[PDB]
XYZ file of C-alpha atoms in Angstrom:
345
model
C 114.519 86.056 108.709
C 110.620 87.647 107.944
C 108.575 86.357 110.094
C 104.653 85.685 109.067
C 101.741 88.166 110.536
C 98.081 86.767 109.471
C 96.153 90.253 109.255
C 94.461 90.809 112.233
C 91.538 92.293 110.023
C 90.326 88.752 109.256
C 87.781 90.449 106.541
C 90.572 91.072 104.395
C 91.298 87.554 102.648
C 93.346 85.714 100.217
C 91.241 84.765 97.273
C 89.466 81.223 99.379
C 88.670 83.823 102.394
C 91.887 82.814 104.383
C 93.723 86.064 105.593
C 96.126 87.908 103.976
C 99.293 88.659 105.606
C 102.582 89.638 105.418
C 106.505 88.825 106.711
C 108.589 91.282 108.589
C 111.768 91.528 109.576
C 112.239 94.715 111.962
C 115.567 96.844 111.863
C 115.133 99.049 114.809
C 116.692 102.571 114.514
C 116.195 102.669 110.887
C 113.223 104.733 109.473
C 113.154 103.114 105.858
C 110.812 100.548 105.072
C 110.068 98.123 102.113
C 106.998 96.866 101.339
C 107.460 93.812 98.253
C 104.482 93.642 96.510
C 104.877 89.820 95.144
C 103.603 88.760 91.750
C 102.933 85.552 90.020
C 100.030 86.468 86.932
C 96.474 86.567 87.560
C 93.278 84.851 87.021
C 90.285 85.774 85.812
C 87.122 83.967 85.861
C 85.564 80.649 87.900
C 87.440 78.502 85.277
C 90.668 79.730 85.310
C 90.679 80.931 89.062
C 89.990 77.319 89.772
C 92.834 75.653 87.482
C 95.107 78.111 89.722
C 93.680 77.008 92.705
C 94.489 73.370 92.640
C 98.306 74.077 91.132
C 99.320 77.368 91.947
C 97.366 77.448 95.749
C 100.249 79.613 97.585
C 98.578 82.220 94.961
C 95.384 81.972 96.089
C 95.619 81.202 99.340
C 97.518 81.014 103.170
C 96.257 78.254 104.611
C 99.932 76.612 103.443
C 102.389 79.103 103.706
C 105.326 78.624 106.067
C 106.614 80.831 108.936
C 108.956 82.698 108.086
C 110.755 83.399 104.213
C 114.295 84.373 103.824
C 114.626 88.232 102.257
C 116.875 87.985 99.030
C 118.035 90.644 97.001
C 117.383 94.118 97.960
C 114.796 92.015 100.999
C 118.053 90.602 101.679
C 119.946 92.486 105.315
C 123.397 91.351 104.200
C 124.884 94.623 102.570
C 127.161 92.031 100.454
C 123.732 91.039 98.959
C 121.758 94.208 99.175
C 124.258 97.231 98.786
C 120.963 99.677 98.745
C 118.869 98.988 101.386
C 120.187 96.261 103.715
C 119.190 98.092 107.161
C 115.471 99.065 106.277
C 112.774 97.321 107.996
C 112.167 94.620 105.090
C 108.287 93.356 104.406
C 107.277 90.366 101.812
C 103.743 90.702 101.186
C 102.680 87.498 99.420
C 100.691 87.836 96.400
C 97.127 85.228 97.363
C 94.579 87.843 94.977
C 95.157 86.827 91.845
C 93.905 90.579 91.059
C 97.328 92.692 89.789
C 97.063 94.326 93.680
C 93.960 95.681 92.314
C 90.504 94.154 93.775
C 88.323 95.396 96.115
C 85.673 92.264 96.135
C 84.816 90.244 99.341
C 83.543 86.358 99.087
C 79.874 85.799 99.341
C 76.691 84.141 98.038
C 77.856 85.830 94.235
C 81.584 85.585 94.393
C 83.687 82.290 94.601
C 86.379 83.844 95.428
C 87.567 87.361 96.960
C 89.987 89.955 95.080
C 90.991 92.040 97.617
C 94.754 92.999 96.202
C 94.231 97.200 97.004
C 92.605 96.123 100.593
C 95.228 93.697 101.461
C 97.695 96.511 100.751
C 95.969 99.040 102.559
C 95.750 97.035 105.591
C 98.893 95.630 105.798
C 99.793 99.438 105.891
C 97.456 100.186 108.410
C 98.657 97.194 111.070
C 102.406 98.188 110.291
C 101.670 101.236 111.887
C 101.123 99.766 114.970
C 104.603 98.337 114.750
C 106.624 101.482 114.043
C 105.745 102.262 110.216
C 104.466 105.337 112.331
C 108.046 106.366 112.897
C 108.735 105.791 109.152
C 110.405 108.620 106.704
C 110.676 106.658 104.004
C 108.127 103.804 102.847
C 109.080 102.078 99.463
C 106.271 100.195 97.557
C 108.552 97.755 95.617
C 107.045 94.697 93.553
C 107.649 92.139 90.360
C 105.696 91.577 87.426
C 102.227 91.798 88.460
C 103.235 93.109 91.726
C 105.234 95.982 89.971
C 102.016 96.903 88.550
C 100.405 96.714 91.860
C 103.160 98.985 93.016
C 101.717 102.031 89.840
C 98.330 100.861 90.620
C 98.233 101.533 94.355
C 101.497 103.753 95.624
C 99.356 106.953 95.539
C 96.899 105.354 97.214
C 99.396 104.557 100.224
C 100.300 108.319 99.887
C 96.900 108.906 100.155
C 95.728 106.485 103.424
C 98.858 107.604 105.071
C 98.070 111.132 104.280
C 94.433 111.093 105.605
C 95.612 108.966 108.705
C 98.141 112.093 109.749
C 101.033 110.375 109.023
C 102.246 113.920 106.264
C 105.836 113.156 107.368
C 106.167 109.789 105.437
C 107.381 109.709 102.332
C 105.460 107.146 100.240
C 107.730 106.435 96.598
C 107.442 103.679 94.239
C 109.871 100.690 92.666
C 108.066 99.118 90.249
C 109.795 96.087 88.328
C 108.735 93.835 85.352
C 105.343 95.420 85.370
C 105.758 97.864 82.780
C 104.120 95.980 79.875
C 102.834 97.504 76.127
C 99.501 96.672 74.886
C 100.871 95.926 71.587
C 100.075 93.380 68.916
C 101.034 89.831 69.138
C 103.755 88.347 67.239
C 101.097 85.631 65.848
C 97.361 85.680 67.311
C 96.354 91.165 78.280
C 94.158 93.906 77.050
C 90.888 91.632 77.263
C 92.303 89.338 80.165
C 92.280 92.577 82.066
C 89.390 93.989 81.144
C 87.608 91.184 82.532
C 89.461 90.636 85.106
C 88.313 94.094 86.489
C 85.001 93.349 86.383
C 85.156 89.959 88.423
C 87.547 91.379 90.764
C 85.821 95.191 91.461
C 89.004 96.029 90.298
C 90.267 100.032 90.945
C 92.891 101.969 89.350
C 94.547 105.400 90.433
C 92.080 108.368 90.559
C 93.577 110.784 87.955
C 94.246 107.879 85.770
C 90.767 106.782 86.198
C 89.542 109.863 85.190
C 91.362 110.660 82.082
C 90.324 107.478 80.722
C 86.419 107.108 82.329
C 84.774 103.930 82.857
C 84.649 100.869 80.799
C 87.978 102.200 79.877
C 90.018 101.401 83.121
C 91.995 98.470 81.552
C 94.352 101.294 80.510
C 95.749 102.015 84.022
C 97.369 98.457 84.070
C 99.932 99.835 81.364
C 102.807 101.732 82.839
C 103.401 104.287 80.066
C 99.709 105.361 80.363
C 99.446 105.136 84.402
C 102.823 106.491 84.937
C 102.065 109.797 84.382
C 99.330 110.720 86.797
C 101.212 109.497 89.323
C 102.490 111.677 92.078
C 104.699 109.790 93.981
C 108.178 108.984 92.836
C 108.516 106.005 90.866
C 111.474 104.330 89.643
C 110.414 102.131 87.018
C 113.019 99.030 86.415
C 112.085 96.787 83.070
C 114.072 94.524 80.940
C 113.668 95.751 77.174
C 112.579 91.937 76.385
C 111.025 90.895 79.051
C 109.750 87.692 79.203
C 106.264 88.041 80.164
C 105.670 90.669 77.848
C 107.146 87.989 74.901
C 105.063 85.095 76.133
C 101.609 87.468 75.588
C 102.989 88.393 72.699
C 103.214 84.772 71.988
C 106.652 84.862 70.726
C 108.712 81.730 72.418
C 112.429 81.522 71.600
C 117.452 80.881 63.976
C 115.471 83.858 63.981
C 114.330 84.735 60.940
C 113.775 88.499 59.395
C 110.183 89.007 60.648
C 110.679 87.612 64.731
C 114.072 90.014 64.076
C 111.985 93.308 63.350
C 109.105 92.422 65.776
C 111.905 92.091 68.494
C 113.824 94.946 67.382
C 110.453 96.952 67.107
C 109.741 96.185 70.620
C 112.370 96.862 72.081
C 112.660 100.437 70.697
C 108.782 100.999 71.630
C 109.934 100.037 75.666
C 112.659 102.461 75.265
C 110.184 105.278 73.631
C 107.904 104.905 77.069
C 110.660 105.503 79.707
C 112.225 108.483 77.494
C 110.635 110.787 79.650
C 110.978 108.511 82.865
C 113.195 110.243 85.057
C 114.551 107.498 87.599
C 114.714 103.862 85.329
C 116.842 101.206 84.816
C 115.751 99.129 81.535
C 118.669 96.597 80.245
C 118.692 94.662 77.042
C 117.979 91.630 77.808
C 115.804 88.478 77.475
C 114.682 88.028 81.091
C 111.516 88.211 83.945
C 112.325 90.081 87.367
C 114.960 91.140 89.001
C 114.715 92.530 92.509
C 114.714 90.011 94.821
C 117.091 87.477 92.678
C 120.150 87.027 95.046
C 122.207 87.935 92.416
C 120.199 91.271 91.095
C 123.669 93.268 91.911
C 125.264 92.236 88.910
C 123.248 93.911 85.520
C 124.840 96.881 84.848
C 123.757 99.802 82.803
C 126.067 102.272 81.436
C 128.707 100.706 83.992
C 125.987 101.467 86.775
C 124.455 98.712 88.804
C 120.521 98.392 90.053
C 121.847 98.939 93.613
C 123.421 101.763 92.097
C 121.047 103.448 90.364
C 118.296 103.276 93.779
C 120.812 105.018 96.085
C 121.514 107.372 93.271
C 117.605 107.913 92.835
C 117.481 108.156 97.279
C 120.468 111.245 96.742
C 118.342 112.745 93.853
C 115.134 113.090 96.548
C 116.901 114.755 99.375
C 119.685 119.151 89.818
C 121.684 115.860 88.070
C 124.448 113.972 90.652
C 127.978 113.500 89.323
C 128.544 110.054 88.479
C 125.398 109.144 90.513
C 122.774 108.336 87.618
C 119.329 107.467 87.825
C 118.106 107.395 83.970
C 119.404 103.982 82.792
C 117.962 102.813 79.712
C 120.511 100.645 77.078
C 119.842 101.962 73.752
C 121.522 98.678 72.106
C 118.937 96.913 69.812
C 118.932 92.563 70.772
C 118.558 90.625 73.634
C 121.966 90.405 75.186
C 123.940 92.862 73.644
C 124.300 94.163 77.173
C 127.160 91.875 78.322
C 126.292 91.945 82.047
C 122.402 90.634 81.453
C 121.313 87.370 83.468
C 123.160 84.178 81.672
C 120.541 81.810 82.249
């Protein structure tokens, strides 16, 4: 039901110099929009960008992708399947930087290939305009894994562009899920992979963050608990307490013996430490990757309160806690699963 738009801005390219893009589906009448910031990793240097680009292309690339995708989860217009949002104007924007949403780097004569994630944002912006975003009160930068760090990377930056094109009227608030990662130590054996990364991709980071931290130090933005707060704009952060990406650069792969038991225990109760102080969050222990546009992302509960939930109760709170209308939701139970509603598997 979202139909594909190549950017009309040809200059701003998936990482082979194809255009970017981005599926709609249109709900006429409402004022809401979602922007999905989609993830899938990164890559980044010639030798690893070009393992990616022969067996992860759709990545990389939109010389392949199909017309149209089918919204799931809260993309999804059924209200069965998307309680929160099923009437907003609904927009995929397919992750083909390889960048974390971050890049600002064109192809040419020294770069292979072009990491334009914050461009490719900013423009798909800018066109949607021209297609009622200019009627908009609400536009919600959502993303998974690397594209819910895009989303804390770049939704003050939409605030910002919408801001300076006299749009003051739209509210600009983030939903950032799976990207809320620790820079810890590994189990056995990100900070370095993004380091670099920034370099090959001219690679930005919020302003304020940017200058607390000062250059050569800019890796430090990609981490939620140290971007987070120099953000303006609302963000509700969603994160599994063991999530599975965070595990796998931890290089931890899963009877669990005493020292895997306190590492997993540790890090746990480190996640929960960073969204303390996180106002609007839903964080459930469990041993899984994603969760917003899974068909079946209606079902965790937290504290007897669903995702769905919890966003509708975070919309009320931005019109003072709400009676029986939460929007902190962090389990404070210590293992993988010991939240009986997490994903089975």
């Amino acid at each position: 039901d979202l139909r594909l738009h190549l950017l009309l801005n040809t200059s701003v390219t998936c990482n082979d110099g194809s255009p970017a893009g981005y599926y709609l589906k249109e709900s006429r009448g409402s004022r809401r929009w979602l922007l999905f910031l989609e993830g899938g990793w990164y890559c980044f240097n010639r030798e690893n960008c070009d393992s990616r680009y022969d067996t992860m292309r759709r990545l990389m690339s939109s010389r392949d992708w199909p017309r149209t995708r089918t919204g799931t989860g809260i993309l999804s217009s059924q209200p069965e399947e998307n309680p929160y949002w099923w009437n907003a104007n609904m927009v995929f924007i397919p992750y083909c930087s390889s960048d974390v949403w971050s890049g600002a780097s064109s192809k040419s004569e020294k770069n292979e290939y072009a990491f334009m994630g914050a461009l490719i944002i900013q423009e798909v912006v800018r066109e949607l305009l021209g297609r009622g975003l200019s009627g908009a009160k609400v536009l919600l930068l959502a993303g998974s894994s690397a594209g819910g760090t895009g989303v804390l990377l770049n939704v003050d930056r939409v605030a910002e562009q919408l801001e300076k094109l006299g749009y003051p009227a739209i509210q600009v608030r983030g939903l950032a899920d799976s990207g809320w990662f620790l820079d810890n130590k590994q189990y056995r054996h990100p900070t370095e992979a993004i380091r670099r990364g920034i370099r090959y991709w001219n690679g930005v980071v919020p302003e304020r963050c940017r200058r607390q931290f000062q250059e050569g130090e800019e890796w430090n933005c990609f981490f939620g608990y140290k971007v987070y707060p120099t953000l303006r704009s609302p963000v509700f952060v969603v994160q599994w307490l063991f999530d599975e990406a965070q595990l796998t650069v931890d290089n931890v792969h899963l009877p669990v013996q005493e020292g895997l038991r306190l590492y997993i225990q540790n890090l746990g109760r480190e996640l929960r430490h960073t969204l303390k102080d996180v106002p609007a969050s839903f964080a459930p222990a469990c041993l899984s990757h994603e969760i917003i546009i899974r068909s079946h992302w209606t079902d965790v509960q937290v504290k007897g309160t669903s995702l769905p939930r919890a966003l509708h109760c975070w919309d009320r709170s931005l019109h003072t806690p709400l009676k029986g209308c939460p929007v902190h939701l962090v389990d404070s139970c210590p293992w993988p699963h010991c939240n009986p509603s997490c994903p089975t598997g």
